[PDB]
Structure 1
Amino acid sequence: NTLYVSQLNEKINMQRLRVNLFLLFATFGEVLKVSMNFKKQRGQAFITMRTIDQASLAQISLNGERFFGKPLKVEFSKSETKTL
């Protein structure tokens, strides 16, 4: 379900970044996660989705996609999310 992003623009703000992420991930499926839990920035963001299929699709399509200068490294999460 969850997809752990990495290698992104740290210079962008938190809320804005979150919004951007939401915008990105709405095409694949319904994004459950509203805000980031880590609060560290610089790539580390867990995009929580409703469906696994959607997540998979996202992983497939947005692997190395241009988001704020740098290519985002998509990958599946190790542990399941608290909401899911």
Structure 2
Amino acid sequence: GRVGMPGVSAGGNTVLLVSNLNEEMVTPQSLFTLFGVYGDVQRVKILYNKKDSALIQMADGNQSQLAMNHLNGQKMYGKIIRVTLSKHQTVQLPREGLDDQGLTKDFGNSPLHRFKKPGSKNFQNIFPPSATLHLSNIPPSVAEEDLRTLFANTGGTVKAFKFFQDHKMALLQMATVEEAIQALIDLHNYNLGENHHLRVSFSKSTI
């Protein structure tokens, strides 16, 4: 085992509340890979009842408070993206994963992620943002010829792409860290190929 303490850095709540959204990226995979790159993630949900808000579910023990503090005011797309630890009961999704309505997203199957606890490929339980964007996914149906249109809409003006010649993985460079985080988030699920974005993330390397 690796856990058994009588508590954790959040409390055992497995939830993370968010506000001040743009309603233009805080719904699809983009938000899910946001909290999915800033740590482990259990689920997602969105709400608009007389107020714009959303909710994520996480491992609430060493990444939800970090992601909370750093995303609570980073304006990486055009909004304060307010964030806090939640204060109410967890979600329930007794349905297949969409609560038969769609405002919920039991995407915990991580169909675009392979994150794990510290011990390999990570040693900080989260990933800090940088202008460099390392990945695994380079399908034969999207390459520079379509990645051009992708980065041409992410936020920067480079996404310098460099890829292997004996594997299916690569790396990208945005012009700045803010558009870097928002660019790999925006394209984290954009390739439409057999590798269907195994992942994109930050690295110490450069291009």
Residue type of the alignment partner of 2:67: A
Question: Any residues of structure 2 matched to 1:1-84 within 5 Å, and which?
Answer: 1-10=14-23, 12=24, 17-33=27-43, 35-36=44-45, 38=47, 40=48, 43-83=52-92
Unaligned runs of 5+ in 1: none
Contact 1:29 1:51 in 2 (8 A): no
Superposition TM-score, scaled by structure 1 size: 0.72
Q: Which has the larger radius of gyration?
A: 2
Q: Deviations over 1:5-64 (max 9, x none)?
A: 001113x267xx33111111122322111x4253x2864111110243211111122121
Distance 1:51 1:75, change over 3 A: closer
Contact 2:41 2:58 in 1 (8 A): yes
Measure, in 1, the Cα distance between the counterparts of 2:22 and 2:68: 19
SS state at 1:26 partner: helix
Contact 2:16 2:84 in 1 (8 A): yes
Measure, in 1, the Cα distance between the counterparts of 2:52 and 2:30: 13
Identity of aligned residues (%): 35
Contact 2:25 2:31 in 1 (8 A): no
Contact 1:64 1:72 in 2 (8 A): yes
Residue type of the alignment partner of 2:22: N
SS state at 1:23 partner: helix
- Size of the aligned set, in residue pairs, is 78
Superposition TM-score, scaled by structure 2 size: 0.33
Decide which structure has greater strand share.
2
Higher relative contact order by CA 8 Å / sep ≥ 6: 1 or 2?
A: 1
